[PDB]
Amino acid sequence: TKPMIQIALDQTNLTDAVAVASNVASYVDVIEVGTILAFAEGMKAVSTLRHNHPNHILVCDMKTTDGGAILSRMAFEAGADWITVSAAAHIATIAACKKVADELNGEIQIEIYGNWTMQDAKAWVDLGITQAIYHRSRDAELAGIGWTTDDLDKMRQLSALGIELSITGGIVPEDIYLFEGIKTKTFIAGRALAGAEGQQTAAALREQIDRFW
Amino acid sequence: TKPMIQIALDQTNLTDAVAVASNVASYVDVIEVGTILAFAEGMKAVSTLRHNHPNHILVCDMKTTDGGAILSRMAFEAGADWITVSAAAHIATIAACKKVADELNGEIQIEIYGNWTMQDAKAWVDLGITQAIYHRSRDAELAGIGWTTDDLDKMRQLSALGIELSITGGIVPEDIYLFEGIKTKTFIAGRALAGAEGQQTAAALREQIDRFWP
């Protein structure tokens, strides 16, 4: 609906992450266990956060590429509401993750990486998947060229298929206007939503979200 | 040299993984911490297994898609010799992993998934990466068809580019002959290499590998 504010926790230990979750909980809608924290600490991270923050949407960012039935179940059982699955997973793996999600009252989000196509995106939607994470393209980022027409058009196409995007990649309040008319579930950021000025920046993000949704 | 025997540990807790590693150590060359174990237990799985088995090649199977510099350094610091990176990782991420690997004297292995191409495979080789993991085609598995000619053709092309493949997906002694003449670093299997019949299975695989390599 109105895009939510999501923090990606990418700490390399649970103690630190637990202290950040505990800090930002009051002004963040979605807390994500990032893949760096997932691989540092394992599903204990997801558990501990789920118990600390029973009322937040909790994401486990595994970027699952294979072994989906098993991984999905582990993450949901540990307490995740949403899990991420790589666009590069075979469609049978994606379907296996979505089957577990539908059984456990969770959702799948496709992390868009690799040589992905619009046909792939339609396959996701055909499984009933309605979420995908769109990252500002790595080429653009490296060239310092910002958000390109190409990206915004791809996002609009994804949107026209029924995918609700989570938008990420240096997102700042001045960029928000760029995505008006794109179906957007969340804007994601890491620690620029954390610490002492995280609050201010979040109010600032929301202020701009309200204008365009 | 000859293809080695690798076990992929996919236990969902560390205690069971440690018991399996302990039981197969003397007849398996490479121990891999599979993504299932890595997500279950985190890097404590890698450092525990590195401590229990200081003389084995240890793999951390992360299928890295992003955050490569950070994840790679974590894995190597934990004791991994080889780590896996997804074919879907952007080339700049792949390069960032390979840089950390070179600094820490480890290696990168490309997990072949997604809409991958021979151009992509040449890009990996250009970075000095010479290992990739080739899984039996999922389409073929689902259809009840074995190893297809299209798979074997693709593996021979990858080999010709200079990639040493690790081959996996229901590998049994009976199929070993199929891969003659492919540059093969390892064959990877899971719990079939463990338990009461694991040792025999491994001997049966080595007996076939010896017929066809080097």
Q: What is the CATH number of the domain that holds B205?
A: 3.20.20.70
Beta bridge partners of B133: B111, B166
**To the nearest whole angstrom, how far is the Cα of A98 from the nearest Cα of chain B?**
18
Using an 8 Å CB-CB cutoff, list chain B residues near A135.
66
The Cα A130–Cα A112 span in angstroms is 13
B180 is annotated as contributing to ligand binding: no
Name the maximum alpha-carbon separation found in chain A. Answer: 44
Resolution in A: 2.1
Exposure b/e, B92-122, CB count within 10 A at least 16 = b: ebbbbbbbbbeeeebbbbbbbbbebeeebbe
SS3 B190: coil
CA B180/CA A181 separation, integer angstroms = 56
Looking up tokens 């200079």 gives: B162
Q: What is the experimental method? A: X-ray
Cβ burial, residue A168 (10 Å; 0-12/13-18/19+): middle
Note down the domain range covering A115. 1-213
CA distances from A157 to A122, A165, A182, B90 (A): 11, 11, 9, 22
Q: How far is CA B117 from the centre of its chain?
A: 19
Chain A residues whose beta carbon lies within 8 Å of the beta carbon of residue B75: 39
My answer on whether omega of the bond before A54 falls inside 30° of 0, hence cis, is no
List all residues 6 or more positions away from A103 whose beta carbon is below 8 Å from its beta carbon.
none
Known binding residue A135? Answer is yes
Based on the structure, what is the number of domains in chain A?
1
Distance from CA of A207 to the nearest CA of B (A): 30
Dist CA A5 CA A184 (whole Å): 11
Distance from CA of A36 to the nearest CA of B (A): 6
- Is position B32 annotated in a ligand binding site? yes
* A77 labeled part of a ligand binding site: no
Of A70, A89, A138, the CB nearest to B92: A138
Contact between chains at B111 and A12 (C-beta distance less than 8 A): no
- Can you tell me the distance from the alpha carbon of B54 to that of B48, in angstroms, rounded to the nearest whole number? 10
The answer to whether A39 contacts B74, with C-beta atoms less than 8 Å apart, is yes
Q: Which two tokens stand for residue B135?
A: 């899984």
Record: contact B66-A35, CB cut-off 8 A: yes
Tokens of B49: 């297994």
